[PDB]
Amino acid sequence: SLTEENAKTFLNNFNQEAEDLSYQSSLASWNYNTNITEENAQKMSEAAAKWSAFYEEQSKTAQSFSLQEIQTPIIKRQLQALQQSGSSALSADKNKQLNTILNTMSTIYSTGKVCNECLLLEPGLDEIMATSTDYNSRLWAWEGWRAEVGKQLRPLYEEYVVLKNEMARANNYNDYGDYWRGDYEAEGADGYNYNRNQLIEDVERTFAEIKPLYEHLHAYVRRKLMDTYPSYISPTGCLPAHLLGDMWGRFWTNLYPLTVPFAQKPNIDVTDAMMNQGWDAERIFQEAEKFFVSVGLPHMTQGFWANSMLTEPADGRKVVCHPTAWDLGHGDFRIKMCTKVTMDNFLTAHHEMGHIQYDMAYARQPFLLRNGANEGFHEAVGEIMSLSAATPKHLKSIGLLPSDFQEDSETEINFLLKQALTIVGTLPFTYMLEKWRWMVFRGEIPKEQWMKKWWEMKREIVGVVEPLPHDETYCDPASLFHVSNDYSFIRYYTRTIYQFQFQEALCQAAKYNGSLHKCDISNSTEAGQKLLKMLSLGNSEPWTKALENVVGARNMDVKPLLNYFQPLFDWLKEQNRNSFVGWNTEWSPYAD
Amino acid sequence: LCPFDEVFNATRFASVYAWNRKRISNCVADYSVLYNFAPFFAFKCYGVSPTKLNDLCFTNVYADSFVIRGNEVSQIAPGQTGNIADYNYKLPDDFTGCVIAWNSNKLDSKVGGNYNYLYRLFRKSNLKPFERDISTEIYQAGNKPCNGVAGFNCYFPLRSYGFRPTYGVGHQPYRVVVLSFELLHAPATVCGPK
Ligand SMILES: *[C@@H]1O[C@H](CO)[C@@H](O[C@@H]2O[C@H](CO)[C@@H](O)[C@H](O)[C@H]2NC(C)=O)[C@H](O)[C@H]1NC(C)=O
Ligand SMILES: *[C@@H]1O[C@H](CO)[C@@H](O)[C@H](O)[C@H]1NC(C)=O
Numbered sequence: 001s002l003t004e005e006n007a008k009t010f011l012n013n014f015n016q017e018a019e020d021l022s023y024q025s026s027l028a029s030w031n032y033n034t035n036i037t038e039e040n041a042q043k044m045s046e047a048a049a050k051w052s053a054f055y056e057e058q059s060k061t062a063q064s065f066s067l068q069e070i071q072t073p074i075i076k077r078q079l080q081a082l083q084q085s086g087s088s089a090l091s092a093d094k095n096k097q098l099n100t101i102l103n104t105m106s107t108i109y110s111t112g113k114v115c116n117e118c119l120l121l122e123p124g125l126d127e128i129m130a131t132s133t134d135y136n137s138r139l140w141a142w143e144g145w146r147a148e149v150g151k152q153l154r155p156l157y158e159e160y161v162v163l164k165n166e167m168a169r170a171n172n173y174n175d176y177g178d179y180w181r182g183d184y185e186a187e188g189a190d191g192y193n194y195n196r197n198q199l200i201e202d203v204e205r206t207f208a209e210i211k212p213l214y215e216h217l218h219a220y221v222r223r224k225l226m227d228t229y230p231s232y233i234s235p236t237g238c239l240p241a242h243l244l245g246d247m248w249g250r251f252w253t254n255l256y257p258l259t260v261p262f263a264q265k266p267n268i269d270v271t272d273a274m275m276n277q278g279w280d281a282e283r284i285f286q287e288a289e290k291f292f293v294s295v296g297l298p299h300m301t302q303g304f305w306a307n308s309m310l311t312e313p314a315d316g317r318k319v320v321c322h323p324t325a326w327d328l329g330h331g332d333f334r335i336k337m338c339t340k341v342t343m344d345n346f347l348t349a350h351h352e353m354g355h356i357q358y359d360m361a362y363a364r365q366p367f368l369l370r371n372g373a374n375e376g377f378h379e380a381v382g383e384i385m386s387l388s389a390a391t392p393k394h395l396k397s398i399g400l401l402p403s404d405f406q407e408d409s410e411t412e413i414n415f416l417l418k419q420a421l422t423i424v425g426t427l428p429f430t431y432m433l434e435k436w437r438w439m440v441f442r443g444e445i446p447k448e449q450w451m452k453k454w455w456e457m458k459r460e461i462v463g464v465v466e467p468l469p470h471d472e473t474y475c476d477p478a479s480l481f482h483v484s485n486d487y488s489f490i491r492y493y494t495r496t497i498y499q500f501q502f503q504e505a506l507c508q509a510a511k512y513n514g515s516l517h518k519c520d521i522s523n524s525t526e527a528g529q530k531l532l533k534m535l536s537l538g539n540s541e542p543w544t545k546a547l548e549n550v551v552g553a554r555n556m557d558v559k560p561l562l563n564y565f566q567p568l569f570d571w572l573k574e575q576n577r578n579s580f581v582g583w584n585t586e587w588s589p590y591a592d
Numbered sequence: 593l594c595p596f597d598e599v600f601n602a603t604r605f606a607s608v609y610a611w612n613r614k615r616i617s618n619c620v621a622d623y624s625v626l627y628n629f630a631p632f633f634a635f636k637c638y639g640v641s642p643t644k645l646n647d648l649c650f651t652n653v654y655a656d657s658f659v660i661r662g663n664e665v666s667q668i669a670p671g672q673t674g675n676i677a678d679y680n681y682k683l684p685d686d687f688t689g690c691v692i693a694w695n696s697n698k699l700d701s702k703v704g705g706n707y708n709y710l711y712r713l714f715r716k717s718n719l720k721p722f723e724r725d726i727s728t729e730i731y732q733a734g735n736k737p738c739n740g741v742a743g744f745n746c747y748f749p750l751r752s753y754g755f756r757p758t759y760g761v762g763h764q765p766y767r768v769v770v771l772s773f774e775l776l777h778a779p780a781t782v783c784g785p786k
């Protein structure tokens with residue numbers, strides 16, 4: 001007669017129907033991705049529409065069971081994971097307006113072009129911003145892009161912000177930022193309870209420890225770019241936005257040829273060594289499976305080698321040609337990847353297989369709990385595998401590097417620098433963008449000071465100065481893919497923290513004596529059973545307990561990150577002696 | 593010869609709730625024919641030994657066949673509980689017999705979906721040893737009196753299996769036969785070979 005058993009029966013029925021409906025939707029999506037045709041796309045759209053209708057109907061039906069009466073913790077968590085409506089809280093007119101605005105912004109971003117050559121975003125602009133080193137050749141493209149796309153998305157984004165705030169207030173939230181920070185909200189005991197507002201106090205706190213390392217890296221990059229840009233870089237100033245190897249500056253990996261510690265000793269590439277031995281895609285996947293089994297993880301399913309498309313099809317099928325790990329359900333785990341015999345694809349195969357091993361762990365949990373702890377956890381389990389499989393010690397065990405090779409100091413320094421140009425350089429930009437979006441959604445930044453505050457934060461957090469003045473008529477934040485299209489961006493910072501946390505926790509458990517970046521979890525069954533303790537929980541427990549089961553801490557920790565680049569930190573501190581670490585927020589390339 | 597071939601090498605097996613029961617009496621029971629039906633996922637005999645089965649004689653040998661999922665094969669055992677051996681087919685505690693189970697993905701899986709096999713998920717109370725329930729009445733979950741329609745607090749008890757070849761190893765169709773031996777005071781007419 002109690003509502004607890006009724007809610008349990010309702011959840012059982014919902015899971016029983018979802019394990020079939022979502023499975024059919026995933027199967028339709030996979031069939032569409034295999035051979036992109038007009039009929040498969042229609043089938044996928046119909047399946048997705050049916051699944052969304054069923055989910056919203058069940059959510060409207062599940063809101064009649066308040067969580068105060070539910071005593072069982074897992075049942076309450078399953079009911080909470082379903083009662084969340086989302087965009088359905090708004091009326092029909094507001095929902096249609098928001099959908100039309102989102103589609104228009106996506107179409108403008110996808111069909112954007114910059115001409116005074118006449119190219120588009122991905123074909124010509126990306127290659128120019130990545131490879132070209134001329135000042136004007138990058139400045140004109142950057143200015144044209146952030147003047148066309150920004151001014152075309154600003155009036156739509158102004159209404160998009162208001163519509164998202166209304167949608168958030170309709171879902172018992174306050175702003176869109178608080179709604180996006182709801183994924184990190186945990187519930188449990190007195191020590192396993194996390195709040196949304198507590199996250200803002202931590203993301204900043206975690207940024208203070210990575211500030212000296214980022215300042216040293218920025219000073220080193222500036223000193224190395226002073227050569228190629230003599231009359232465009234100040235000794236005590238910031239760096240232009242169009243001289244960061246990217247249109248926005250998210251990844252500084254394109255600056256490796258210009259910022260290299262030792263050019264006389266290039267990085268280690270096993271492409272030719274893999275081609276000489278006659279390997280292929282199936283060999284790479286078998287080696288990845290052996291690596292994942294050596295650490296003490298469950299074995300791959302038989303369907304993974306039959307139903308999954310590991311190599312590019314020669315039958316004329318048009319695939320999107322990008323790595324993806326699909327979990328259709330009922331024990332169906334596949335990988336769709338444009339796999340080749342290259343080294344980057346070799347590492348991506350181990351990266352994507354980590355997501356599969358994660359999906360094969362929480363399969364025993366109910367359907368409403370078959371997901372990672374948070375948005376920064378699922379992508380953190382596969383990333384640590386590449387960090388352990390891309391070490392010079394693991395390559396010699398498999399047979400890619402001969403036994404006569406020895407680890408050199410200059411090569412390790414170059415590798416650490418190349419990894420910091422991609423992992424450390426993306427944290428300040430992400431933090432600044434997330435803080436800006438939070439303060440804009442929260443109404444703290446007036447709509448007449450968006451660009452001013454954006455470029456002011458570009459100088460204090462990331463240390464980037466604009467080469468030309470941009471008033472409030474533009475919208476440069478909206479020029480990013482994650483900002484234009486509705487998507488979260490704080491997940492990358494949490495992922496970057498959690499990957500180093502997991503790496504340290506799994507390397508200290510195997511009693512390894514050496515550098516953190518040279519760890520090797522192979523031939524260590526204790527490092528797999530300890531990681532499986534968290535992978536088998538998924539979303540049935542708060543993320544604090546899942547993090548404590550691995551590293552012991554119940555919050556983010558930046559100390560493992562500083563220990564990963566400690567030799568690189570010391571090298572940068574020793575090389576940046578004859579310079580000023582930092583940047584003044586007054587220099588401007590456009591000003592005389 | 594007892595018709596053991598028509599039980600294991602049948603053409604179409606029944607559902608789990610409507611488990612097909614066959615009585616075996618007045619025939620020589622060759623317990624060596626059970627083998628040869630592929631590597632079996634399970635050949636677990638309770639209370640008896642699989643070797644000395646030809647050294648005894650029982651009065652009646654009831655054969656109960658049904659198709660279930662792969663993760664639910666362990667639930668067909670005395671004492672264990674779950675979702676199959678609670679409302680569909682429950683085994684006695686003091687069960688002296690043999691449970692055989694083998695995969696049948698090649699025969700009982702369709703690309704579009706084999707929705708012919710049903711299973712009972714909701715019921716008022718658990719079943720008794722060797723009890724069958726074939727009712728299709730709406731499960732009255734809440735106090736709201738259901739009127740034959742489905743919806744809130746009124747769910748259908750019989751659900752369908754989405755058997756497809758694309759499944760893994762735990763959700764493929766698995767055929768399970770249960771041979772239960774009876775030793776009543778009646779004279780034994782089912783002996784082994786000679
Ligand atoms: C190219 O795409 C078409 C989709 O129209 C595929 O045709 C389907 O193939 C699957 C698997 O055999 C089945 O659903 C049907 O045979 C086809 N469906 C329809 C609606 O016609 C075709 O197989 C793809 N090409 C290749 C080489 O796989
Ligand atoms: C790891 O184990 C494999 C086989 O178990 C063995 O061939 C290899 O030499 C081992 N590596 C180390 C470093 O012990």
Ligand SMILES: *[C@@H]1O[C@H](CO)[C@@H](O)[C@H](O)[C@H]1NC(C)=O
Nearest residue numbers: 597600601602627628629630
């Ligand atoms: C089952 O019957 C078929 C057809 O009668 C036959 O081909 C097959 O060999 C039989 N199985 C066994 C194990 O004998």
Ligand SMILES: [Zn+2]
Nearest residue numbers: 323324325352
């Ligand atoms: Zn990815």
